[PDB]
Design a protein around this ligand. Sequence first.
Ligand SMILES: [Mg+2]
Ligand SMILES: [Mg+2]
Ligand SMILES: [Mg+2]
Ligand SMILES: [Mg+2]
Ligand SMILES: [Mg+2]
Lengths: 51, 146, 185, 180, 201
Amino acid sequence: AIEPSLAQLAQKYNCQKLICRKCYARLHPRATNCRNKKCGRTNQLRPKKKL
Amino acid sequence: VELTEEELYISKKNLLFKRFVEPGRLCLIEYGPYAGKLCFIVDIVTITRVIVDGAFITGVPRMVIPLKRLKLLKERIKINKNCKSGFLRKTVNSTKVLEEFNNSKLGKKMIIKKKRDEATDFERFQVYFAKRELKKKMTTIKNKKN
Amino acid sequence: KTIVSTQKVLIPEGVKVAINARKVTVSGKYGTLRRSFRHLPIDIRLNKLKKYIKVVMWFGVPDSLACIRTVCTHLKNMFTGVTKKFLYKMRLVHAHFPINSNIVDNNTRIEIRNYLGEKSVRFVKALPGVVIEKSPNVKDEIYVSGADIENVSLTAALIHQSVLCRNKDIRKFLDGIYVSEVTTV
Amino acid sequence: IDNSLNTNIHQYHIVGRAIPTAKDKNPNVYRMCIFAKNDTNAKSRFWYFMKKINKLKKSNGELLACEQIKERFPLRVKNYGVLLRYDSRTGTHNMYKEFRDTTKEGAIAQLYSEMAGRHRARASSINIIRISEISSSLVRRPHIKQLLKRRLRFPALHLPTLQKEYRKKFASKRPSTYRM
Amino acid sequence: MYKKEYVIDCKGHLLGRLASLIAKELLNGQRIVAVRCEDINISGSLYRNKLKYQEFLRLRTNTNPKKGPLHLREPSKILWRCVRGMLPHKTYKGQLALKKLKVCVGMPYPYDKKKKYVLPSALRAFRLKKHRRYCRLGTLSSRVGWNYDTLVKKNEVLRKQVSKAYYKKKVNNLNEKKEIKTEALNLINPEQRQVLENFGY
RNA sequence: UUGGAUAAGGUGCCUAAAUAUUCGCUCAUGAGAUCCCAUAAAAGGUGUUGGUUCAUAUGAACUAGCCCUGAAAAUGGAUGGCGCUAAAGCGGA
Ligand SMILES: [Mg+2]
Ligand SMILES: [Mg+2]
Ligand SMILES: [Mg+2]
Ligand SMILES: [Mg+2]
Ligand SMILES: [Mg+2]
């Protein structure tokens, strides 16, 4: 019982993110660079896999 | 279109930074062959280097120095950015800025120091004697009070 | 090294501001907020006759400029808080088990219970001076509010953390308690 | 005069030519301004440049004159543009940098420091190609533009560089960096 | 360094530089009471400093740690250790120099009432740019298991009130003296007075 | 042997000599630190510093400085140590 707007909101946090192809960090969906020092801030970002 | 009573406010707004390096800051050189000498900031070369000029009252010629070497004083004299040394001399003499500086605490103390440095043994002894006399008098007054 | 760089923050109408040595203190209708900036070099100066306060930075790379802007933003936020509380509207979403959101202790401390049905209590105390109300209008949501934008936001974040489920597929299990709308009153 | 402050780069006009030969009795003369620490260094630089550009080596040419150029208005601030060729550890580059200074010599002194500091480019690896005063309508570099602003003013945030006499390591009172 | 005993108020000082300054003086031959060592500063971030100290702690002697690097972690003791590092402490002279150094946390039974000097060559205000991370030594020590920090702070606070009280009295005394001088400049001779005026007093 | 004045090297302390002056760069949640020398690379970095070439005060592409990642081994631990960040680091003068 998850009404669509609420579900969308939930997704916004849990799902519509980028992920570092190197260290797996959750990033905002609009990010260019990893932010984590261990990757050496790579540009290699991919979308969080949907379903 | 004039201000009226906001003028007062502007006058009495405590700014954090007074003494900006700008044309006609008085400036006491701290480091170098010239030290304890006064000299005006004529031009500014870059963020760190300035052209100073003790207009010929003071000992220091026109030359570039690091701002690091300077100690800006409360005194200013409005001068044209281009101003050559003769003009500076004319202006400063007219405005009596050096006198003002001397009157001011720092200048006063400097001159006192100079005097102390230049004293004769006898003069030192005279001062000592005077102090002793004062102490005597002072002590007596303290006793009276008590 | 940019010789001078500045920023102008317009104080609103019913605000009693008072900076000193970067220890800014703002008072108004809701709360008295104090928040020091004495870690960046900055001669924030006040104009009480006119409105506005000037943040000004002498020299400094782009870092300094950035810092100045941040400071200005913070000031603005503070002003907003004192005029009108920040209202973080947190909707809780559940799949199966409805979340029991019991506010206690003068609308601080929100006990969350029955999150994914585990019969165990999640305590999440609010920061200094930040009310946690529940909905008048809709059914599920939770208002977090109180002047300091920092603190209310922090509280909200804490609340969210208190919920978020551990070792499962989080794309499938959307259950939790999320910030819907950042607003004012 | 202050000798702690000076940088002893001067500018030298050098003129030289190839020694005349039966086959080429009237050879071309070449000149240049060269920024060098002394006259001999200048000469050497000139020779090097001759070698690089023309077929001309010190042993088969002769210096006609070495003059030494003193700045005409050594207390007027000017905006100097410089064009360099420098060598990095990886390769070779041109760049154009601008320096607000009181003389060409001063600018060059600044430049050498900057290249050393910012690029780790040592004096050997640099070749100044031209310095010229840029009138302030054509200044492209923002750190120079700022200086050229109308009624320039700024506070004194530098810390005191007290004389070594009055630098004493024990202090009565915690000094103040604020000053005023 | 021709005084009998310099008290150094270690607050606001940069650990290493301060230590260096101390060490030379000690060598020369000069008792130095480093006082208020909770407030010394280190130029790294706090976390960085902690990490360094953690690393230091980790180096014990494998065989038998009763011997081997003693990890003295009162701020005063840290300071002392630092000072030692910059002395030839394995000689006799060095040892003597080391002994000459006393260090304290807060300020106690004579060093409240002694003048407290400052080494401005080693002052954090003058030595780090204000956009740099620094760290209070006391906090660092606390992080690495010192414990007596709050207590020390309390003590300091208590002392400050006393100091303030003393200062008021001192100020009053000074004022009185000034008044007396004003009164009793008129009662001397003329020429002498003039002379006095000329040289400042 | 006495005195002088240097060399290489240094000049925060250990350590005799600069907490010298002067211009940059650099913050490192395992900084860096001087021939032989006692290790680091390819590849990255919307880290910051300059540039260069292009387009319409933004967008690109490069480029090389320092820094970061890459960077994991066994007794505890080594720029020689302390420590240093308005350097006591790196490059100059
Ligand atoms: Mg599973
Ligand atoms: Mg001999
Ligand atoms: Mg000698
Ligand atoms: Mg020595
Ligand atoms: Mg050394």
